[PDB]
Ligand binder design. Structure first.
Ligand SMILES: CC(C)(O)c1cnc(N)c2nc(-c3ccnc(F)c3)ccc12
Ligand SMILES: [Mg+2]
Length: 302
């Protein structure tokens, strides 16, 4: 890509406010100057050292974010600064006004979501992942914070900042990256074993952890230092839901994502056939319930 070809955003997009109290770093609520359309705008310095990472992120946004379960890319802008000073890059995308899944859990009594909500959100994440995996992309940072909701309760993935683009379906990677509590054992192995590798199945493990996060309010081992969780994830039994209150169908779905040996872990197509994902006869009411929660939360703040 050509960063020099990018337009200055003045008169096109404007920054309104930093989002989520800094939880996502330099991500802003923005607005189109002419139409008033909202957007999320990620702001970064263009240093010569992060060129490959910036290119990977723009390429993912440009090529794959049109899918209904990914927050859509609107374009990129550059604020040029004088010689010796770093230019700033803006990546502009769809604004998911209802916030994250982590926020949904925080704003729900008992910090636990109903199974029917978890089935709906997991299916939408799996559809977004299936689209990415079909295009040889590994997201590598699936977690509740990167799963957002629109005001209409549509589910959208964000943040391609640590993603990978493979050359073949069976392609492998070895970068130790991601968020510890959600990381698959085979990704964790790359920190201390230089010969260890992984593949796209790592995203399905992260999805299973995200489902536990929605059910129990936090991923397993959340109450421990991340270095201790990294030590335990490869050696502990695969996580399961603690309570037997959950349906056997949901318990079975978690048992399916959370296979430690990734060679034996299912891909998205096999997981989307699971009865927990496949059978959703109340999805219309789930979306009404989610929209009612969204509307109430918006009113409660002021
Ligand atoms: C309302 C909310 C939860 O603050 C929001 C809303 N809409 C978005 N698209 C957001 N996007 C990101 C995001 C994070 C990392 N890399 C990105 F490319 C985008 C973060 C927050 C977003
Ligand atoms: Mg989209």
């Amino acid at each position: 890509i050509d960063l020099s070809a990018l337009r200055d955003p003045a008169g096109i997009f404007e920054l309104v406010e930093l989002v989520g109290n800094g939880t996502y770093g330099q991500v802003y609520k923005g607005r189109h100057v002419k139409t008033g359309q909202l957007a999320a705008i990620k702001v970064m310095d263009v240093t010569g050292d992060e060129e490959e990472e910036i290119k990977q992120e723009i390429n993912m946004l440009k090529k794959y974010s049109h899918h209904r379960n990914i927050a859509t890319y609107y374009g990129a802008f550059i604020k040029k600064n004088p010689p010796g000073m770093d230019d700033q890059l803006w990546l502009v995308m769809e604004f998911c006004g209802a916030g994250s899944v982590t926020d949904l859990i925080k704003n729900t009594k008992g910090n636990t979501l109903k199974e029917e909500w978890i089935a709906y959100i997991c299916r939408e994440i799996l559809r977004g992942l299936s689209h990415l995996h079909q295009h040889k992309v590994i997201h590598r940072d699936i977690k509740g914070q990167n799963v957002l909701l629109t005001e209409n309760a549509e589910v959208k993935l964000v943040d391609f900042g640590v993603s990978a683009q493979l050359d073949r379906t069976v392609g492998r990677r070895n970068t130790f990256i991601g968020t510890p509590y959600w990381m698959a054992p085979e990704v964790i192995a790359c920190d201390e074993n230089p010969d260890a590798t992984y593949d796209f199945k790592s995203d399905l493990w992260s999805l299973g952890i995200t489902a536990i996060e929605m059910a129990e309010g936090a991923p397993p081992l959340c109450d421990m230092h991340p270095m201790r969780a990294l030590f335990l994830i490869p050696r502990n039994p695969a996580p399961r839901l603690k309570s037997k209150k959950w349906s056997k169908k949901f318990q079975s779905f978690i048992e399916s994502c959370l296979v430690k040996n990734h060679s034996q872990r299912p891909a998205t197509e096999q997981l989307m056939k699971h009865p927990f994902i496949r059978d959703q006869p109340n999805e219309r009411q789930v979306r009404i319930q989610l929209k009612d929660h969204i509307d109430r939360t918006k009113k409660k703040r002021g």
